[model samples]
Target: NEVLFGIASHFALEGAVTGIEPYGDGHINTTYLVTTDGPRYILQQMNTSIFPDTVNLMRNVELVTSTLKAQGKETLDIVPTTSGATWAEIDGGAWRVYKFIEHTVSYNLVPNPDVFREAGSAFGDFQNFLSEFDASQLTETIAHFHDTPHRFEDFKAALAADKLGRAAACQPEIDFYLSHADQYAVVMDGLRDGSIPLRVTHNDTKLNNILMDATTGKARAIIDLDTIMPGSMLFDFGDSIRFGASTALEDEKDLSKVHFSTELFRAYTEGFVGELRGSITAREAELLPFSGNLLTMECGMRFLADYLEGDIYFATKYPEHNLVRTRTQIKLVQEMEQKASETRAIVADIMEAAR
Candidate 1:
């Protein structure tokens, strides 16, 4: 309550403070709805532990939001404190308030293939917005975040330094990643080898980040800008396939909970590639199919590595939470493997159709 009130009062938003409660299905940040006599707003207490440099992180948000606002685009409206600051630190919590663009809504699942397609379009549009910005202008809050080679190296190091000696027990997960490690860099290597172009990408390409209009239900703006850093456009598209095109939630406990949704995959590729076809380099356009395999392998390795590290990377509700997530990624990777030919064919068809 104090956290919400501090943020709300900081905004100087006058009205009765009716209530504050969990507002979203987001797994990362503490999102809350702030009810006031006037227009309600969102009070977000950023998980600063995960993002230690709160100042620079919020600066990125400011930069992105300011650019959007200049174009008359709606985004998170940062409400300032009475002291006229964009954010505040109180009681060890990092908090900020935003004028909740009313009547806007978001969905956890794809309402349909079209809505999923729109999500791809929205993210694609974001890349277009930042096309002129030097990708290196943004700081990598998470070092080597999208680097497959670095991630694998970290995984190996963690395995070697497994203080709990848990690696022997998870041989299947270990060998799974090791066997597939050769394929992990297909996309990143393409980027390095001039087979794909580096572009500004929203690295977190989850569906809920795109806001839809209340009346029209069209994607209006994309949120959750923390992961918006330098990377290949392939990272965005490939990561979207890893999560959005999957049939199961990321942390679903059941190993049987995962499958690859080819329909969703094609729908997204149609929208994503269609938007970038003219703007993206010929090499990037050619390598989109191979990126799916690369991102799946990258994600699977991270999940398995986190499990071997005793779940220290990802916060969990149970001791086996990371293990469960690791298994789901493994299952999804298997599905992607089985459907590899069909997946590439679908992408090829979409690119051809778009052309």
Candidate 2:
């Protein structure tokens, strides 16, 4: 009902619009696969609730994809209608098109260390591509995005409310992360004070966001460019480690179910920092291993914060949903702490070898 005029007849197409239904099981956007005479293309009706600044957000997309295509990188090429526009507003929602890249597949799991290594390389290359672009050129569509200190405030607010009384449920998780709250500033300062430096970041750096080859099992390109924003390299690197390196589910209710795999950390770091040898600044390189800790703290704080806020931020299946996410991240931070020295050693070895 929100979609006013509907999306059909809005675009100049080659074939009959046979199927205009939900394409992929995407969490955020309302996406569809548009089958045309030539090939299948993805048509996405932007979710206005999530993205407030629809125009700048898409402009950011234009910047990223155009830059990548200029370098001959494999990326989604936005198809324009006959009027030479990237997007069209039908009724109230925005509509855009992308030529669905042929023969590309996606993976939900990290699978093995080797695949993670490929993912690291893919992300590393993604970062490297943005090295030259001036990050200030892009608009901050989602305000306070990746703003760590602001996120801390949100966490404290959650703690104050504790409406669900779920605070007591996540005590171990809370205590675990509260002890390490100070560690979050190191990377935050890196961004705020300009120590580690800033670049274009895929704010949502999940493994499933990457598109890969079906047969070779090699990473082809990173997709889902919605959250592309100005952030630090550490954020992306650390988030990858948080999800891929962890041995268990991020939202697992049972404490014993979670396992933080150091091998995943080593492989991802080896492949990620391996590719950024020449481009990444010496300082960012030095704190590479610490990134895992920084991101873990950042995420754990977010989870705990969301829980405290009465689970308003994250869509929770139960009362313990945010609490569960908080606990898992705190557990991961604990594991990363135990393996900190080893993690640093791995980073040293990788850098030394890459050099």
Candidate 3:
């Protein structure tokens, strides 16, 4: 806690420092609300284990935020240290600060289709502004973060090892992923051949990553830029639908309760493509339907792999937690497949309507 004050002092905070308390419901970084006599600010200790290279990570943040600011768009403003570095490394940890966005609120859940649509707009607009930026220039903060085919291979290897012998209990789930193994190559093939243009993708585009105006109920900002990197627009659009359009919890115990909601899917598509407004290529727009299917299966593969590996990757509350999560993701993938026609139609309809 003392390090927080030290980091705060490094920044030119307004007035006298009043307090620092744990803030937000983020699962990755340790975050805090830093209060002063004037405006509030956000302080976070970067999860170095996941992101070992803070130097390059902050550098990417600086590049994107500065570019967005230049375009008269709002981004996570990285508050520099007094000596003028975007982040500070101290006591074996990396820390950074952000000028708190006043009067903005964030959600951990998609409360409804309307709010979820607002989130789609916020993220879609984010892509629209960054469409001109050279994605190749940006660092791959987490290499292969959304490489679905590679992830599928990793899942296959895990299944072969059966390291913890957990494979026996989850044969059906493993079969579910194995059956869809070919789908993993869809986006990767596109990237290899250059049909889908690479862009600055927020790899984690969950609803909670978006901040909304508390009064107007409109999306005001997009936070948690850690996963911003060079990738396809499908990564952002698909991941959003993967999580936001789901009808049940990500780890719902009852598999039957989980589903892919085409209505919610249509709402988000309307909002996203409407904001994008022809910025994406025809092929890119066409693949939006499959993005949900691909990312959801990829997520399920990771969860199943983690379970097979004795839950080394994701933290599990119980022995079966990761397995439960994998099941739910698989269920969503199944529903997405069942509703594939509607999904494609929704994207086609939205793409046409947005024009």
Candidate 4:
């Protein structure tokens, strides 16, 4: 707590700070709501392990926020340090601040299907706002961030090495991943071929990453921009469905509990494509449903890859923890496969309505 008070001094915030209290449901960063006699602000300590390149990441935030504000769109405004840096590094940890978007609500869970609709819309709005920004201008803050082909390569490398001799136990999982190797090129192929346009996207497009207008219950702003990168909007949409639109935990042991929720898919599609309908391409729209499947399969392969490599990348509680996690992702993918037609049907309905 003493360190937080000291960290607050680096930012160019107004008013005598009244309290520096831990706030919100933030898991990755150390977040606090800085109450003051004049204006309040949200302060966060950057998690360097996830984002070791804090300097460029804060720069990414600066570019996005500055551009959005100029476009007359509401976004998380960065409060620079006294020395005018986008972020302040105190005692080896990086910290940044933003003037809190007042009179807004934040949610930890969807609470209802309709909320995902608004969240999808906010996600689309994020793309629509930065549609013209040259995504390559921003640095790749996290190397291999949502690069499915890269993940597949890593998975293969891990399998070939087998340093821990764990592969013998998960042969089926290895086979599962190897069978669908062709699908790894879904988005990357499109991007390379110029079928799907490259655009600025939020890697962490989740409910918790947004601020909901308290009065209107609509997402007013998207936060946690450290994972912001130059990727297809399809990656964001796919990742959103990857985390949500599922019935069970990431590590659910019982595969029976894992199910893909098309109802949830419908809501997000309604909101997401609804906002980006005209801006979204025919190829991009056609591939929207498959993106979720690709990401799910991609994630499961990562889990299996981690397991085969002795659980180095993803945290594991037990020896079989990563194995169980892979199973859940595999299960979800299978269910999505089963309901692919319905999922596509939902997308068509929503895409039509948005038109």
Q: Which ten contiguous residues of candidate 4 have the minimum total lDDT?
A: 105-114
Clash number for every model?
0, 3, 0, 0
For candidate 3, the per-residue lDDT at 207 reads 70
What is residue 1's positional error in candidate 3, in angstroms?
5.7
Off by over 4 Å in 3: 1-3
User: CA shift at 37, candidate 3, in angstroms?
Assistant: 1.9
Q: Is candidate 1 or candidate 2 better by lDDT?
A: 2
lDDT of 3 by residue, 70-112 (tens): 9998879988888888988777878899999888888888888
Compared with the true structure, what per-residue lDDT tens digits does model 1 show for residues 243-338? 888888888776666788899888888777776666767677666666776787788778777877777777778877777777777888788778
Off by over 4 Å in 4: none
- Give me candidate 4's TM-score against the actual structure: 0.95
Give me the runs in candidate 1 sitting further than 4 Å from their true place: 1-6, 12-22, 82-84, 190-195, 251-257, 316-321
Candidate 4, after superposition: displacement of residue 191 in Å?
Answer: 0.6
Q: Provide the overall lDDT of each model, using Cα atoms, as 2-decimal numbers.
A: 0.78, 0.79, 0.87, 0.87
Scored against the true structure, residue 140 in model 3 reaches a CA lDDT of 92
Q: Which scores better on lDDT, 1 or 4?
A: 4
Estimated TM-score per prediction?
A: 0.86, 0.93, 0.97, 0.95
Better of 2 and 3 by TM-score: 3
Best by TM-score, which number? 3
Winner on TM-score (1 vs 3): 3
